[PDB]
Design a protein around this ligand. Structure first.
Ligand SMILES: Nc1nc2c(ncn2[C@@H]2O[C@H](COP(=O)(O)OP(=O)(O)NP(=O)(O)O)[C@@H](O)[C@H]2O)c(=O)[nH]1
Ligand SMILES: [Mg+2]
Ligand SMILES: [Mg+2]
Ligand SMILES: [Mg+2]
Ligand SMILES: [Mg+2]
Ligand SMILES: [Mg+2]
Ligand SMILES: [Mg+2]
Ligand SMILES: [Mg+2]
Ligand SMILES: [Mg+2]
Ligand SMILES: [Mg+2]
Ligand SMILES: [Mg+2]
Ligand SMILES: [Mg+2]
Ligand SMILES: [Mg+2]
Ligand SMILES: [Mg+2]
Ligand SMILES: [Mg+2]
Ligand SMILES: [Mg+2]
Ligand SMILES: [Mg+2]
Ligand SMILES: [Mg+2]
Ligand SMILES: [Mg+2]
Ligand SMILES: [Mg+2]
Lengths: 325, 154, 216
RNA sequence: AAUUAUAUAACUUAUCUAUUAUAUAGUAUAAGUUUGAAAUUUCGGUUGGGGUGACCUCGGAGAAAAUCUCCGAAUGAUUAUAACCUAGACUUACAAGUCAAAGUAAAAAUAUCUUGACCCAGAUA
RNA sequence: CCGCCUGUUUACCAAAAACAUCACCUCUAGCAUUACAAGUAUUAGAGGCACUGCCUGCCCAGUGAUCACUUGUUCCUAGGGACUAUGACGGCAAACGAGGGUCCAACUGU
RNA sequence: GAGCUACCUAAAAACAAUUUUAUGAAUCAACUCGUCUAUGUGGCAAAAUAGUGAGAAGAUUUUUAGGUAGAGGUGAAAAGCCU
């Protein structure tokens, strides 16, 4: 009677062991040991206060160091130290958000520009959605999540981290509707459409026990995930204005669920709707964050930040798609 | 000769109170369930066992027996008790997650060849990492730190 | 493969592994246990193959009833574990021949090796076949084993010699012209069995019953 | 499985003797702890019947009020801190649950938005 | 085909492939005046298991070579001392059987 | 309540003929058992009859008196036996 985590571990061994070859051992200890958190400042009240204290702890912003307007603090290579819990600031806004450094990369790779309307088709609580608010280059951020409970969390996160003036009536907008239906609701509307599809959440499913995608009863859903992911990605691609950019991000490493999904979407969009979407090179990004990330350089489409005990930031897969017309 | 080595390693066998001597033996026989002859090997092969809190000693046996699959004879023949729990947990767990070790199921079957218990502990850290685990030294050092936190947060 | 002396039986599992890798598994793609199934005609060692692999890999012991005469294993049984590392199970099934064998000769050969109960053929239209092929193929070994005078190609003669050697006789009713009479006679039937049972035991030599059909 | 367990076994502190410089011995008993021979009691519900799963209370939407189709809650943040008293009613097997004039008192009207009985234990005054 | 064999059993639907069995194996016990036993480890008790021959797993510090290093284990503080001279598995043997399948001969009102 | 039955203690009995040998060997009576079929099924019988069978110098069978008692006894384990 294997538990949900047992099945998830069992299923991963047979598949991933072939995908990476001899890196599975390394990638396997990382998922079962612990995670590494990267703190993101709120940029609204303590833009300086939190930065000074964190530096005294020896934590350094990896984004700022790489450039050598998002700034997220992470510890040095191989340092296992933790971040003191976030606190409420003088202005009434939290000091910083603790998130997996990898989650920030998609946002950072989305090439945000000033005066750009941005859509989060499946806006998970905080995470990438909060980071987009941190950057000032937004006009009308939108967020959606098929489930209503998580959005309730999303509103609290925004409230505690975003001043009311910025999150005005039209500045942000939270609607709990289906994502695939979004293909019709809007069209050629949002310049940037960050689409993070619901995924297998490898790291989480191993540790997580409740609501695990690998439960036997939930078999129905697990098989159909690639189909649902394609539809959600298709909906976002239709919505993006001509010449717009979208990023497809996923938490897992299953090639069937990361590399084929984007290629699939391209073919379905190529044929049914007679549109062409061309991928954008991220190799320059690859070379920039070598110091504080561990990714295998064999991904045909997109990039994939595998975990590693030295770094542990992961697992993420972010692909950038530009709509040529 | 058995007394000679035992006395040298553990001079206080004669000087320890009857309480400590009896308690250690009772665990080995009443809880660990070592045969009469095996116990003598434990006393002679690893004299230091006589100075370990009975409960602490019992844990060490349990960890091997249940969470490693070693038989009673395997524990005795390999001088397993002489090692320290801290080192045992680090090396075994490291492999148990790398996928280079597996706990025999009910049937006693394992789908991978577990490396020799000598390889787990007897060899040096550099030998253990290079051959049994084929891993870099740094990653292990990082793992040791993480391991401790889990104990603290256990 | 030779089941009794575990010849070449190791190679089977790697080939099954490699062979499966090329194929698809669909519904069972997630199961980690590789279950394969053994079939064939009776008395080919089908049940023995279970045991030979059962021991060669798992080193456990016999698990399927191995018997000389056809029909020992009747129904499709449950799985029998064979290996642990690939975790390979085997399904054992009863021997099936055909609803209709092709030719009278193939059916005659198929009885030589012991695939079909000999009394369905009589054991007298089959002993003759041995002498033919044994002499034809040149394996003149029965003469030495049965201390026969010299090579021959007549069942009534060889079975006369074999019967005397084994000191076996019957009381058989013969029908003469003045009425039935019971006369002691040498066991032609018993010699045929023993002549068949020596051949099948391999002490009469190695044979290639299908010859000049394989070359072509 | 739950609750026990001077069955045996062990230790520990007393009690009672011996001794001894405080001390190691024992022990017609009491109090603990460990071990467990035993003892007592039980086997929720709904699901052609058997694996597993699941589901069992209340709230929101459809069918449209009988079973079916879907979402959520065992709160959450905001805050002006929202008093006492008392007509008439709603709802309702019981139980629990709703609304509220008048009067008085604080202040200088306002709480906005979206749930578990009894017993028995507590905490402070 | 199964069980080594003579034995044993579900008085009253099961006589057997079950049970016992010599042989083999593991565990426990260093001892007297009521069992074991008026005995003393070539003994006694508890329990497993066909025997014989044949086979192979474990395990058997490493490298120099009876010698030195590297290890290992401990302490004193990353340094300093102290110490370390063969198998658990299979494969098979005649004889016997009111055992369970099968064949032929003879025999017959089946 | 062990006059049945299970096991035990003490004191006693029985085993022809034939062949092997020097025996839990062989053929087969007495004796012990109960394989297969038929009859019987309120029957002669609350387990028998008639045939056919297994053992038959042994771990055999039988006789007498004693022992173990229900939270138990006995058990070459059938959860058998204990009127
Ligand atoms: N010489 C020899 N005999 C073999 C070999 N394999 C099996 N046998 C013999 O074949 C008989 C066993 O057949 P078995 O393994 O039961 O095969 P089966 O096909 O499953 N039997 P069935 O006829 O019931 O279908 C025995 O007589 C056994 O000695 C082999 O490799 N060599
Ligand atoms: Mg009421
Ligand atoms: Mg009023
Ligand atoms: Mg027998
Ligand atoms: Mg007999
Ligand atoms: Mg009966
Ligand atoms: Mg009887
Ligand atoms: Mg009988
Ligand atoms: Mg009977
Ligand atoms: Mg038996
Ligand atoms: Mg019989
Ligand atoms: Mg006939
Ligand atoms: Mg009596
Ligand atoms: Mg006589
Ligand atoms: Mg006799
Ligand atoms: Mg007889
Ligand atoms: Mg006889
Ligand atoms: Mg008896
Ligand atoms: Mg039984
Ligand atoms: Mg009675």
């Amino acid at each position: 009677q294997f538990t949900a985590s047992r099945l998830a571990l069992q299923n991963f061994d047979m598949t991933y062991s072939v995908q990476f070859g001899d890196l599975w051992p390394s990638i396997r200890v990382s998922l079962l040991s612990e995670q590494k958190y990267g703190a993101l400042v709120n940029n609204f009240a303590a833009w300086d206060s939190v930065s000074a204290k964190l530096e005294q702890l020896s934590a350094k912003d990896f984004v700022s160091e790489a450039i050598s307007n998002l700034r997220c603090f992470t510890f040095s290579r191989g340092d296992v130290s933790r971040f003191p819990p976030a606190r409420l600031g003088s202005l009434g806004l939290m000091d910083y958000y603790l998130m997996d450094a990898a989650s920030l990369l998609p946002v950072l790779a989305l090439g945000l520009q000033h005066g750009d309307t941005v859509l989060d088709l499946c806006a998970a609580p905080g995470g990438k959605t909060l980071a987009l608010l941190q950057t000032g280059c937004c006009r009308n951020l939108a967020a959606n999540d098929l489930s209503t409970s998580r959005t309730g969390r999303l509103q609290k996160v925004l409230h505690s981290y975003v001043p009311q003036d910025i999150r005005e009536g039209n500045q942000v907008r939270v609607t709990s509707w289906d994502g695939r239906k979004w293909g019709e609701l809007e069209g050629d509307t949002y310049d940037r459409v960050l689409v993070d599809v619901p995924c297998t959440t490898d790291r989480h499913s191993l540790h997580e026990e409740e609501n695990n995608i690998f439960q036997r009863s939930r078999k129905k859903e697990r098989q159909m995930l690639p189909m649902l992911q394609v539809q959600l990605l298709a909906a976002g691609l239709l919505a993006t204005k001509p010449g717009g950019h979208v990023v497809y991000s996923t938490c897992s490493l299953s090639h069937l669920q990361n590399e084929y999904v984007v290629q699939g979407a391209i073919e379905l969009l190529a044929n049914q709707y007679n549109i062409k979407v061309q991928v954008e090179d991220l190799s320059h990004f690859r070379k920039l964050f070598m110091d504080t990330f561990c990714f295998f350089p064999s991904c045909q489409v997109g990039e994939l930040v595998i975990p590693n005990l030295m770094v542990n930031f992961g697992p993420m897969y972010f692909c950038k798609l530009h709509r040529l017309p | 000769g058995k007394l000679k080595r035992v006395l040298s390693v553990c001079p206080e066998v004669f000087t320890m109170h009857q309480r400590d001597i009896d308690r250690v033996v009772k665990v080995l026989r009443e809880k660990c369930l070592f045969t009469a002859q095996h116990i003598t090997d434990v006393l002679h092969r690893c004299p230091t066992v006589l100075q370990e809190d009975p409960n602490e000693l019992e844990y060490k046996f349990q960890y091997a027996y249940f969470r490693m699959g070693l038989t009673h004879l395997d524990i005795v023949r390999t001088n397993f008790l002489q090692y320290s729990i801290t080192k045992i947990k680090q090396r075994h767990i490291y492999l148990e997650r790398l996928g280079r070790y597996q706990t025999p199921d009910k049937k006693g079957q394992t789908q991978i060849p577990n490396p020799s218990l000598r390889n787990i502990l007897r060899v040096s850290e550099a030998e253990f990492l290079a051959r049994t685990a084929c891993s870099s030294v740094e990653e292990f050092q990082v793992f040791k730190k993480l391991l401790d936190q889990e104990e603290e947060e256990e | 493969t030779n089941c009794v002396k575990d010849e070449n039986i190791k190679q089977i599992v790697p080939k099954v592994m490699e062979l499966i890798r090329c194929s698809y598994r669909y519904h069972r793609a997630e199961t980690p246990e590789y279950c394969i199934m053994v079939v064939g005609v009776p008395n080919v060692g089908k049940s023995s193959l279970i045991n030979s692999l059962r021991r060669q890999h798992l080193r456990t012991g016999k698990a399927a009833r191995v018997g000389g005469e056809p029909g020992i294993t009747r129904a499709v049984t449950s799985r029998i574990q064979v290996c642990e590392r690939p975790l390979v199970f085997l399904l054992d099934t009863p021997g099936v021949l055909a609803p209709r064998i092709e030719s009278v000769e193939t059916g005659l050969k198929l009885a030589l090796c012991g695939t079909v109960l000999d009394h369905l053929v009589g054991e007298e239209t089959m002993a003759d076949y041995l002498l033919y092929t044994l002499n034809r193929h040149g394996l003149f070994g029965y003469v030495q084993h049965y201390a026969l005078a010299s090579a021959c190609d007549q069942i009534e003669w060889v079975l006369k010699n074999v019967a005397i050697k084994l000191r076996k006789t019957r009381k058989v009713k013969v029908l003469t012209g003045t009425g039935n009479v019971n006369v002691i006679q040498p066991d032609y039937a018993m010699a045929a069995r023993d002549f068949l049972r020596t051949f099948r035991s391999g002490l009469l030599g190695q044979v290639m019953l299908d010859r000049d059909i394989i070359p072509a």
